[PDB]
Design a protein around this ligand. Sequence first.
Ligand SMILES: CC(C)(COP(=O)(O)OP(=O)(O)OC[C@H]1O[C@@H](n2cnc3c(N)ncnc32)[C@H](O)[C@@H]1OP(=O)(O)O)[C@@H](O)C(=O)NCCC(=O)NCCSCC(=O)O
Ligand SMILES: CC(C)(COP(=O)(O)OP(=O)(O)OC[C@H]1O[C@@H](n2cnc3c(N)ncnc32)[C@H](O)[C@@H]1OP(=O)(O)O)[C@@H](O)C(=O)NCCC(=O)NCCSCC(=O)O
Ligand SMILES: CC(C)(COP(=O)(O)OP(=O)(O)OC[C@H]1O[C@@H](n2cnc3c(N)ncnc32)[C@H](O)[C@@H]1OP(=O)(O)O)[C@@H](O)C(=O)NCCC(=O)NCCSCC(=O)O
Lengths: 142, 426, 426
Amino acid sequence: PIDQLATDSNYLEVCYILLNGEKPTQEQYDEFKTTVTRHTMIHEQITRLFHAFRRDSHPMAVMCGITGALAAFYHDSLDVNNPRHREIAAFRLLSKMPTMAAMCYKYSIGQPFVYPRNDLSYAGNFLNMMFSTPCEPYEVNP
Amino acid sequence: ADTKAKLTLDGDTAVELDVLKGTLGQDVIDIRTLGSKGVFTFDPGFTSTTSCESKITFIDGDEGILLHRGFPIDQLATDSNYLEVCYILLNGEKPTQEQYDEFKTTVTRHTMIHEQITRLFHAFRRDSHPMAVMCGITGALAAFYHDSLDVNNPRHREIAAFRLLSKMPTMAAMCYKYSIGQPFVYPRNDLSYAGNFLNMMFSTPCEPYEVNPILERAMDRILILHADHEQNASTSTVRTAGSSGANPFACIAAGIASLWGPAHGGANEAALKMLEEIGKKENIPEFVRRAKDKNDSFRLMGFGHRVYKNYDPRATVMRETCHEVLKELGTKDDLLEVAMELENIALNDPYFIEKKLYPNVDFYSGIILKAMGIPSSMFTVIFAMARTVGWIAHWSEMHSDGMKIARPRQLYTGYEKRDFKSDIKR
Amino acid sequence: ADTKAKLTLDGDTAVELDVLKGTLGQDVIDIRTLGSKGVFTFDPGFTSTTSCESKITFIDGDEGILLHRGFPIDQLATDSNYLEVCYILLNGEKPTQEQYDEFKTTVTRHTMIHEQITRLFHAFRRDSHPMAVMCGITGALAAFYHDSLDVNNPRHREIAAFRLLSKMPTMAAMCYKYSIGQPFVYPRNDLSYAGNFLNMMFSTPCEPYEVNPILERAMDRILILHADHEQNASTSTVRTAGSSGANPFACIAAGIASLWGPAHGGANEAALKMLEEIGKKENIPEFVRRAKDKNDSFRLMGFGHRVYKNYDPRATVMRETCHEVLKELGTKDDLLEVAMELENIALNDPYFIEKKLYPNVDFYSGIILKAMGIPSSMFTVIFAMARTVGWIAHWSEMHSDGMKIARPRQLYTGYEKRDFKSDIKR
Ligand SMILES: CC(C)(COP(=O)(O)OP(=O)(O)OC[C@H]1O[C@@H](n2cnc3c(N)ncnc32)[C@H](O)[C@@H]1OP(=O)(O)O)[C@@H](O)C(=O)NCCC(=O)NCCSCC(=O)O
Ligand SMILES: CC(C)(COP(=O)(O)OP(=O)(O)OC[C@H]1O[C@@H](n2cnc3c(N)ncnc32)[C@H](O)[C@@H]1OP(=O)(O)O)[C@@H](O)C(=O)NCCC(=O)NCCSCC(=O)O
Ligand SMILES: CC(C)(COP(=O)(O)OP(=O)(O)OC[C@H]1O[C@@H](n2cnc3c(N)ncnc32)[C@H](O)[C@@H]1OP(=O)(O)O)[C@@H](O)C(=O)NCCC(=O)NCCSCC(=O)O
């Protein structure tokens, strides 16, 4: 049920369940999580893209724009057939979507971009990339 | 407070005029009524005209008095920090503790400049004077802060100011980092206002820069002694413009260029480097380079001052600070021997002694900044930076007045209505 | 010399002040040295103080008279052209085909803007207001064209003067293009000042642009009609900014920001909204803004003026052109005939007759412009672009008078000296 999942789980655990079909063990979860964390940063070139939109555009149109443009930066794995292609491709989305999501807000309000932090949690890592500045140590409220 | 009763004027008819008085200063004659009576005074330069009423800063040029809201500068410099002075200068009274926190915490809250604005610096050439970049970035903030450009609204002023007050140093640092080719440095919410500057001025992403409290207090003071200076060219420009509708950012960008005009003049130019060029402990000592003095541009080099007669009050704390920091920056000073020299040549020479080219507050400020490895190009910027709190004030106080705006009259002496008939056909 | 022989400032000893006389208009009382005799006037408003002596433009309010270098604005705006006019204001006389042809040469051969400044345009946001961007740019001019900034070398002054004259059109049309996402257009020597500016505003690489004969003339006329308006607030900013030494461009930027000035509030353009936002006889007026206008909501659309008493000597011809213009375009006007109805209102609506809200040139210019396919956020920009030669001529004047340094006095009504004691921290 969703209710249980919401109160008794964290987002990633749910991605796994939603993606794999069963509750993750411990060693299996680490594999899943550690990976997601491994590829959160988006290519510098991609970043130059945000910068080609006007700050005054709806951060939602920038989202459909940056995402509908990743193909041109990940030429290789665009072949739906290959089983590992899906394998990787997904993780890329799953991993980088929040990074991209945060960035749109930082572009919209005029603040600098914030790189993912490997220590924070998935969710904490978001609020981090959403609100921190290079001016004061942002602390996430659990 | 005697003949302040009233007066009268008359070439063909008499008009009863009053004689106003200040809490300090001379006696003025309210001619505010003669405009109607069809009477107009002629006074280029506002040479015998009082343009306004101010409760901000008092100067007694002939007796070396400088009060900011009544508080002498000297005390303020030694007994206060820059921000506390901005508040006093902006609010009218010493800040309590809880009130100061409010003021400070805010200033700290909005120090970062919009990323888009940043892309601007990058459109200038690195080789341009960091002072032209300052008048350029500032005269361009309007396009990034469209909303609050309406001088009327009381909160508009409210915010607008804080933006300037907060971001000017950030912008100031950046210009130096752009000029020398180093990366930009974001403000740090822990450091002090002054420390935060030296931080954004010199740190790199390669080594943890530590601020020397000594060097900081000096900047702190360099700053305070520059917060504001009563009515003058740059301040008058600011007030005028503001009165002419124009937005605060433009007003500040106009003031900033007014505080750069003397620097670039030619006779001054050939004399600015003149000093900052030849100093080989053979020249200055036997008044060699000082043997040349046609194009003076002295105050531009920290000599004398239009207002003050014998000495610039703001020059004491700085002369002492100047010494201290030199003692602090230890023995690395050699060229700055001519420093020890120039003062000696300014106090012991007739000419100077007679034309009163007395080291003003900038003579020593320059020595400090130099002692700090800061290039000359950055001098007028830091001054303009510190001076902005003053410009807001006057600007603000000019609004809160009533500002029946101002359309100065001209005494036309050109041609007399004549017919036109183009002698051309192109 | 009518009802004024020799006036007497009466303190306790009779002070006779010599009355000076202008060639046109009111003569004045002298008061320059008063200060040198501890006697200062008080006039926060400069409505009775004659800032300066001039010879460029003459305006007789009541009479609705405006002359440029002696010539009636009417004749100029009909038989001359912006360039000849430009030449005139700047040189005091009408050119000879040779003076005019040489002038026209020097001008067109500098209408190109440094490409680095184009890079500067892209740094600015796409949603920025033309006027705003316009300032952002002008102000940044002193950072590139750094040789024509020697404000006191007549060799460097005419340089900038010409530069500002050649480039303003180029810049303004780049403010437009930029705001609408079309590529910037290059000057065209083989074009008249107005025809080229029309071209640069509207031409597209997709095909050659055809400059309509009537539109070309109608524009020039707008240019001519805004070239100068005597000592207003903007020229007072350009005059006051320049007195402190500020480089040419710095002042012009000020005159641009200031010009924009009285227009930035929630109901400054919010009024200038249902002017173009709505185009229909019975909607905008029809029992609408009979009370829908709130703060200024008058003096912004082109109704009334603080200089002229009954009418605008410039509106006279501007109107004559709307006719020629609306007529011409045809399929670009008849809908825009909610003017006669607006115009009409002003003429007979009591609220207007009582407020002297008569239609002015900016109204007829607004119409013509709102007709050429020019947006309202580009009206002032075009009005500033033109007022530039006016600003330029004034600044070059004040610098001939010996750079009249505007350093007024103040009336101090703040605290007398009081010791400073601070118990806080931070
Ligand atoms: C296929 C991938 C491993 C690499 O694809 P990618 O799109 O180039 O990832 P990316 O562009 O974000 O990362 C490129 C580089 O940046 C590194 N990187 C990116 N973000 C981070 C980060 N937040 N912290 C540290 N390193 C990072 C990433 O580790 C790689 O460095 P290296 O090759 O030295 O390990 C990844 O997309 C993925 O999720 N793979 C899982 C699916 C799969 O079958 N992978 C095969 C190897 S098993 C992967 C694993 O267990 O980590
Ligand atoms: C009106 C303002 C609050 C905001 O205007 P602004 O020009 O957008 O400031 P800004 O662009 O530098 O800041 C935009 C964002 O960056 C943040 N920011 C900027 N610099 C820093 C910094 N050094 N450290 C942390 N955050 C920063 C700023 O806090 C804001 O984030 P958020 O909305 O989440 O709090 C400010 O200009 C100001 O000084 N206001 C005081 C005047 C006033 O009447 N303010 C009304 C609210 S009371 C303000 C207060 O007490 O802080
Ligand atoms: C110091 C100056 C010489 C240069 O200042 P600048 O701002 O760096 O140059 P600029 O931005 O005006 O660009 C003008 C240059 O591009 C050329 N140029 C600009 N627009 C055009 C155009 N539409 N078609 C052809 N050439 C053009 C122009 O001929 C000039 O070349 P040159 O080196 O021979 O003068 C300055 O005085 C100036 O060029 N014009 C100001 C007025 C003036 O006094 N000019 C000197 C006499 S020009 C004689 C003439 O060509 O009629």
